[PDB]
């Protein structure tokens, strides 16, 4: 599991459950191609997106469907989604956690890169 | 104006208006002594807390009454307040903006320090 | 001035100066069309991107070039950029401030929307 | 484990390791009395602070020694510490995670309250 996504809800103080998350890899023509996707779990986590053999160096985008999450809660949001765009780099053994903290008009994202 | 406080509301995307702010300074005897207080304006800003002359070196605490803010709006929030504690003016006088961004279960705070 | 961008640096506690910002608008055909661009001032602010007349309804993306910012300062940061994507003016004209707070492995963004 | 603390470092994109954390409970005379403390682990987590039988309703402060953490890294920080102050409330079965994201001149804190 070299890539995990974790999302929290700053309004309810809970995991953000059932949030859709799409991953893309940047193709040699500069377009984004689908690479992995899933819905966060009851713990706000999304595991099993990819494997070490598949997750090669490259630029990746992680799109988190914040707008659908807020609307399912009856809450008016600002952003269409949150996008996290980064280069994966093979400088020794590494696991990437992309964490996001959601508010209707604000979000933060942080990368926890370990091992 | 060496000390300014700005507060935003991440749920509405708006300045957080009428937020009470109390500032204290640590005394010779380790007590927190009341230093200045005020409330944010329509722009979410609080100016005029103190002066260049009064704002001497010290350890200061800026306590932002986030609970009263969220309660007056029908939200029962997590935190009692947001406390920002810092040493000021230890290399001479500086101008400090203390910004806070508020959600019911979360806050961030940043300091902008200029000469 | 219906669209303003403000960027702060959480490592230094300072405005983030000379940050390039590109804005795009989603076209009829789903493409991101270049809309306006500029760079933050000494105060970390970018004004004058557009006008009331030009800033029509639409889905807009504000791409903040955080990587070039951190690189020019000797830091190799995590993210390629910070992208803020939102629907604007769908209930009539509003004024939008898009604020971002930058660290090498993390960013937050907030929107202040006023009438 | 009704109370857990998790700290991340936004500059290195890692867990914040060996950060001292002190917990206090507000006494009937309004002073803060020591209640629990520890150092975050290699995963930036601090478990085993208290038990359900000990963790009664009351106001608690969690003080995270951010200033020592930054100084051990050779990095100049703003805040003396980060303090998170909240009321623990027995509305059914609940676990409190206090998460903090640290930058030298900024931090965010969020409460994840579950079960």
Author numbering:
A (entry chain B), B (entry chain A), C (entry chain A), D (entry chain B): 10 to 124
What does the paper behind this entry write?
Transthyretin (TTR) is a homotetrameric serum and cerebrospinal fluid protein that transports thyroxine (T4) and retinol by binding to retinol binding protein. Rate-limiting tetramer dissociation and rapid monomer misfolding and disassembly of TTR lead to amyloid fibril formation in different tissues causing various amyloid diseases. In the quaternary structure, the TTR monomers are arranged into dimer-of-dimers configuration and form a β-sheet rich, homotetrameric structure. X-ray studies of TTR show two funnel-shaped binding sites for T4, each defined by a dimer-dimer interface.
To elucidate the local changes in the halogen binding pockets as a consequence of ligand binding, all ligand bound structures were compared with each other and the apo form of TTR. Entire tetramer of the wtTTR in holo and apo form was superimposed to compare the conformational changes outside the ligand binding cavity. As is evident from the Figure 4C, there are some structural rearrangements at the opening of the ligand binding site. However, in comparison to the apo form the secondary structural element of holo form are slightly pulled towards each other in AC site whereas in BD site they are slightly pushed apart. On the other hand the B factors of the A and B chains of the apo form on an average were 16 and 18, respectively. Thus, the B factors for the both chains of apo form were slightly lesser than those of the holo forms. The comparison of cavity volume in holo forms of TTR indicated compact AC site as compared to the BD, whereas the cavity volumes of two sites in apo form showed no considerable difference. Comparative analysis of unliganded TTR and TTR-ligand complexes reveal that in the unliganded structures the conserved water molecule forms hydrogen bond with the side-chains of two important residues, Ser-117 and Thr-119 of the thyroxine binding pocket. The analysis of hormone binding pocket dimensions in the crystal structure of wtTTR apo and holo forms show that the binding site dimensions in the holo forms of wtTTR are slightly dissimilar to those found in apo wtTTR.
